[PDB]
Design a protein around this ligand. Structure first.
Ligand code: ANP
Ligand code: GLU
Ligand code: MN
Length: 406
C-alpha cells in the first residue's frame, strides 16, 4: 500500500526505503516544476563538500537567525529522526507535517519515478515554500552536479572541503570529486571555495559556467583572543571561536559576504557563539570525557585526532563502527595515532562493516555484539582521566545517543 497524508511518518520512510532503482535531474526537476517548488525563498545558499557541509550550514543558519531572518535548512543524513533533515527557525517540524508534504509529492509526481533523496528533497522544498522564509540553505546529498538539491538556482554556492570518503578506484581522486561538486555553481554568481588545496577541475568548471570564483587563501582567508577573517583589505577581528571547525565557520562568512546581505556585528558574533551540531565533537560527559563524533573518513579523522590531542596520565578509548564501503583502513590508521584502546562493533544490515572487518586493521582490538555493548564496556573500563570517543559513522554515534536518550 502506498501510504497517505494521514499515515505515520514511519510508513512513508518504509515506502521511500523500498523505492526500486537513471542518472540526470530531468525527472526530479519536472516534478518540482509541477508543484512550483524551485523558489523556496528569495535567497538560496547551496553547500557542497566532502566534510564540513552540515556545520557550515549550521553556522550560516545561526548567524541569519541572529539577524532576525526566517531561515530554512535542509540537511542530511540524520542521527535519530528523519525530522532532523528540515529545520525552520532552527527547529524541527512534526512528523505529521512531513507525512502531508510527502503525500503532496506522491500525488504531484504522477508516474514519474523519484529516488529516496529526490523525494526527500522535493518534500523539503515544499515545506520551505510554505513557511515564508527569507533564506533557504540546502546541503548537497552527494556530489552536486546531479544532486537533487541542484535543481534550485542558488544565490551563492560553496564547496567546504575536498577529500576521499571511499576506497581507491580508477579515475577517483580529488580532481574527479571536485569537478562533480563544482556543478552547484552558477553563472554570474559567487562560487566560494573553502578548500585550501583546491583541485584544478573546480576552477575549470567555474570558468566554463562563468561563476565568480572566491577561494580560500586567494580571495579570503582567516587566522587563529578569538580569530580574524579577511577578504582583501577588510577584516573582522576578535571573532568568537565557534563550536564547529573554524574552516567551516570561515567558509560561512565568505558565503555571507559574497551574498551582500546586510548583517550586524551582533548577529555575526551571536551566531558564531550559538553554532554547533549534535555529534560533531560533542562532549556528552566528563571524568571520563565522553565525546561523540561522526567522523567517517581519514580527513575527518585527522581533524578528530588534532582535537583529541588538545584535551588529554589518561588513555583514549575509541568505540567504533563503520560502513563497509568507507576507507576503513585509512580512517583507522589515522585514528591509531592517538587511540590507545579499541572497542569495535558491527553495524547492522547489508551496508555495515562487521567488527571483524574493523579489527583486521588493528592489533588485538576488542570485538563486541553491538555498539551499545562496546560503549558500556568502554565506560566501565574508563578511568576518570580517560577520553571515550564514539566515532566512525552516524549509526555509531546515534546508537550511543539512543542509549543515553539524548
Ligand atoms: N573543514 C574540515 N576539515 C576537516 N574535518 C572536517 C571539516 N569539516 C568537518 N570536518 C569533520 O567531518 C565530520 C562531519 O562534519 P559535518 O559538518 O557534519 O560534514 P558533512 O559534510 O555534513 N558530513 P556528515 O557528517 O556525514 O553529514 C566531523 O568529524 C567534522 O569534524
Ligand atoms: N562522498 C562525497 C564525495 C567525496 C568522496 O567521494 O570522497 C560526496 O558526498 O559526493
Ligand atoms: Mn551532512
Amino acid at each position: 500500500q502506498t501510504p497517505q497524508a494521514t499515515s505515520p511518518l514511519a510508513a512513508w520512510l518504509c515506502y521511500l526505503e523500498h523505492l526500486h532503482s537513471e542518472l540526470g535531474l530531468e525527472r526530479v526537476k519536472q516534478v518540482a516544476e509541477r508543484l512550483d517548488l524551485l523558489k523556496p525563498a528569495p535567497k538560496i545558499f547551496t553547500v557542497a563538500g566532502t566534510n564540513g557541509k552540515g556545520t557550515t550550514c549550521c553556522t550560516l543558519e545561526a548567524i541569519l537567525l541572529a539577524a532576525g531572518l526566517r531561515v530554512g535548512v535542509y540537511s542530511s543524513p540524520h542521527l535519530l529522526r528523519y525530522t532532523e533533515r528540515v529545520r525552520i527557525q532552527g527547529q524541527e517540524l512534526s512528523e505529521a507535517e512531513h507525512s502531508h508534504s510527502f503525500a503532496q509529492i506522491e500525488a504531484g509526481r504522477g508516474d514519474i519515478s523519484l529516488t529516496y533523496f529526490e523525494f526527500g528533497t522535493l518534500s523539503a522544498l515544499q515545506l520551505f515554500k510554505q513557511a515564508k522564509l527569507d533564506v533557504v540553505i540546502l546541503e548537497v546529498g552527494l556530489g552536486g552536479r546531479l544532486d537533487a538539491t541542484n535543481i534550485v538556482d542558488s544565490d551563492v554556492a560553496a564547496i567546504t572541503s575536498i577529500a576521499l570518503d571511499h576506497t581507491d578506484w580508477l579515475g577517483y581522486d580529488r580532481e574527479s570529486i571536485g569537478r562533480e561538486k563544482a556543478g552547484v555553481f552558477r553563472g554570474g554568481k559567487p562560487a566560494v571555495v573553502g578548500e585550501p588545496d583546491m583541485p584544478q577541475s573546480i576552477a575549470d568548471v567555474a570558468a566554463e559556467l562563468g561563476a565568480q570564483l572566491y577561494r580560500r587563501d586567494v580571495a579570503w582567508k582567516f587566522s587563529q583572543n578569538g580569530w580574524h577573517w579577511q577578504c582583501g583589505e577588510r577584516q573582522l577581528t576578535g571573532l568568537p571561536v565557534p563550536n564547529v571547525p573554524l574552516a567551516n565557520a570561515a567558509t560561512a562568512l565568505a558565503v555571507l559576504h559574497y551574498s551582500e546581505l546586510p548583517l550586524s556585528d551582533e548577529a555575526i558574533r551571536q551566531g558564531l557563539q550559538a553554532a554547533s551540531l549534535p555529534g560533531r565533537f560533542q562532549v556528552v560527559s566528563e571524568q571520563p570525557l565522553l565525546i561523540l563524533d561522526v567522523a567517517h573518513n581519514p580527513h575527518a579523522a585527522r581533524y578528530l585526532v588534532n582535537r583529541l590531542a588538545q584535551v588529554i596520565q589518561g588513555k583514549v578509548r575509541a568505540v567504533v563502527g563503520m560502513l563497509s564501503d568507507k576507507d576503513i583502513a585509512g580512517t583507522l590508521a589515522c585514528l591509531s595515532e592517538r587511540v590507545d584502546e579499541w572497542y569495535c562493533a558491527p553495524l547492522e544490515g547489508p551496508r555495515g562493516a562487521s567488527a571483524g572487518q574493523l579489527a583486521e586493521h588493528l592489533v588485538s582490538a576488542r570485538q563486541f555484539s553491538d555498539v551499545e555493548t562496546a560503549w558500556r564496556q568502554a565506560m566501565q573500563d574508563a578511568d576518570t582521566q580517560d577520553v571515550v570517543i564514539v566515532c566512525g559513522s552516524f549509526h555509531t554515534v546515534a546508537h550511543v545517543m539512543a542509549a543515553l536518550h539524548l
